[PDB]
Amino acid sequence: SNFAIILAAGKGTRMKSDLPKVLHKVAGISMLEHVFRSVGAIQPEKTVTVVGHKAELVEEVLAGQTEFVTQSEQLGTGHAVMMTEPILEGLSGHTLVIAGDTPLITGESLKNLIDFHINHKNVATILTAETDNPFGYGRIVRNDNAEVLRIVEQKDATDFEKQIKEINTGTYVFDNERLFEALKNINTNNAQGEYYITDVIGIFRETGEKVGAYTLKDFDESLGVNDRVALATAESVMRRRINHKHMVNGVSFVNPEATYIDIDVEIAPEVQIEANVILKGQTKIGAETVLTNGTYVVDSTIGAGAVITNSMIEESSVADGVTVGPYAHIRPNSSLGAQVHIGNFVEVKGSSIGENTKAGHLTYIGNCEVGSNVNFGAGTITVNYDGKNKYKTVIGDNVFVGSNSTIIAPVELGDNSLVGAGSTITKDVPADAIAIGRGRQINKDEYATRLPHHPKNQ
Template sequence: MSEQASQPGPVRQDGEAPRRTVVVLAAGLGKRMKSAKPKMLHEILGRSLVGHVLAAAEPLAAARTLVVVGAAADQVRAHLAEVAPAAEPVYQAEQRGTGHATRVALAEAPDVSGTVVVLTGDTPLLRPDTLAELVRVHEEADNAATVLTAAPADVSGLGRIIRDEQGHVTAIVEERDASPEQRAIREINSGIIAFRAADLRATLAELTADNDQGEEYLTDTIGLLVKAGRRVGGYVAVDATETLGCNDRAQLAQLAALLRDRVNGAWMRSGVTMVDPATTWVDVTVTVGVDAVIEPHVQLRGATTVGSGATVGPDTTLVDTEVGAGASVVRAQAQSAVVGPECSVGPFAYLRPGTRLHRKAKIGTYVETKNAEIGAGSKVPHLSYVGDATIGEQTNIGAATVFVNYDGVRKQHSTIGSFARTGADNMFVAPVQVGDGAYTGAGAVIRRDVPPGALSYSGGPQKVVERWTLTRRAGTPAADAAAAALGEPAAGATNDTPGVAAGGTAGDPGETAARPSDASGQPGSWTATGIEDPVPGTGSGTSA
């Protein structure tokens, strides 16, 4: 669930909002991720780490947003162009610390004034409201800098915030340098700081790399500001998890689980039922309607929308898919599909891109669709492939139907009209049209158009070779069962001529002892050569 944006910060006495600049530090490769992909581009809940940070900063209405890139800069630039085109990449050729990265960013923006908010690109749980409050506190107090702090349960390895009696921040002490008294402090530095632009620029010029890592640290600016007599404030994040960073895959999974719980909690408080939130993953870009029910083991990804009163799951993945109000999608996978109101999908269905189901349409068990439009009330109940096809309203597609859409060179489209009934095991060889109210018989291969109201079937009469099992499979349980049904003793002999029944000759399988046809010779009576359907091709096998 997208988080509600906070209102911009205070207005100056001259009536104008303070000018703001956001700097996002995203130059690190993230070696501990052990990935060819830059750390900042790894995703949780449908958005990259740096994408989450940029989204949190958006309500600040910054005049400029500068993103410092370094390792795999081309990949990060391309990603920024896609997800945050207003952001300006700034290249840091050498990764020489957070202070150096900030100085590189400001060198690209020499006219920056007002408030500069420096963010780390790997803190995806940061909330817009928290950033807005940090900036509000900073600007109302007219601080030289204001540090976003937190009080997590585990403070090991983290820099401690030292405050004076007035509550002003006087120092950030790294744990390795802290005294026992300072180590007992529970307030820690998040690495996120709002600065007055002029003070930031002045202190960045004084930074040195005189430390074990040989880097310029942004946190050293706090000590320099205090030494210069400038006031530094601190704002404590209400939720300490917001300041958590990501350095490896284990932390990535931890952050994903925390964000999942936050997002799911927001949806449930908004009227959505989640039967098992721990196995429900909803991207931050997804929307879900009131009274929707999300069953266990569901993933809703990308631009997916779920309408009011719809049921999704269990065991369902929807990507960029629209589910209408009151629809049901069970044990299915869908991508770039539209499921209309009150439709039924699944179980075990696969809706591929371009699928569109109109109101009350049904896609049943083991059905795959692609670039297919299914009209209102129409049904494809089982075991079928519907690709590059349009099906009208209130039409029933028989089981095991395949729309044969590919001739080895190109894919072509077929159309089935409204109120049509197609037989089981049909093949529609594209391009072909079946008109409104038409029927097709079971097993039909439809290669030519079928006019409205017509019946189309294919194949000759059914052939029957009587006593075949007794002669060709003598001694088997099937032959014994047939003999018993015919009231004959089981035979042990086997005819070694394939396809020839007892009393017949090669190439003449139908000349057997057969039941006599009736005197009228009407279709449907047994003959030496087979049996015909009284109305050829109407054994459609269609199913609701």
């Protein structure tokens, strides 16, 4: 049996945040969730997450895919593991211990760690890495024979030990039985006055039990995030990982170091992404679609062959061949049918737009059901709100909504109808009719010579 203990009860003072450190997001999900996903790879029979600081909030995210234990007082990583005793003490197996603030460690690395622990028959295996800047990390102390002696914390380290480049990642595999026994022998006699889980290594060394170290193939994965500088580094590595995956799958990136794509976004092959594109949440991008600089898509599905030019799209569906932008805003609950064109400075919200309809400019379409082949002249405003309630407008197929018209819901524009430009519409317009609601033009000869803008008046 394999067990897993995730430490997530720490205060994260260095984060300077009211939000528990492990809940800070990296590429769209909490660091804790990235850790949960990696832990999942070793398929533990039992997973125990230790919560403390604002345990209330932490238990929210994934409150069933693991057991929870509360650490009333954050007395140390070692003490946090102690909190799992009621559930794990007494069982036999291999127990993975991992921090909730090391989101870059992969499930593959954990599986490699477990495999190594088993094959070498260690009582404890430490996941390690090397770095030129080990400040803040426990250092792996070895002897002339490269044998692991112990782990020394930054605060407790001497000037000499601080020069060690091999660091403790905060992840280990322990024989479950021996783990809790060794735990009984740790105390708060250190620079932090805390119960260090790292002290069990020295304990196993005293008993002569086998202690090994499995080194990460990719040292970038070792990042421990204690502050926002490290969080930004975590974002950079995860961003590179996600984008690398998309490029391998056939997606071109003008600049993968500057494109922000969340962990679960799906992107089909042949999609072209310019730099500075943001794709978040449950977003899916279809084949050959082009996303230009500035595009920001959240929880939306975009079809194939679409061209999203510097536009923001939220909780919406965009069909194949659609063109949006530049500077368009497709708000929640919108659906853009096949080959629809939404041009610059257009806002669509809570509306369904039929195939081949076009709204090229300076338009607002809200709470509307719009047919196919409809044309919205520039400046068209669908009026749907009266200060208390929202009203719906239905627009048929092939309707021509004149430029600068004002459509006051609830009304229906029948198939093939035309609304004259500049018109305010307060009543239904029958299919095949035209509707005009505007003042007639009157010219006043020479009147301009009397006004401030005239050249002769300045």
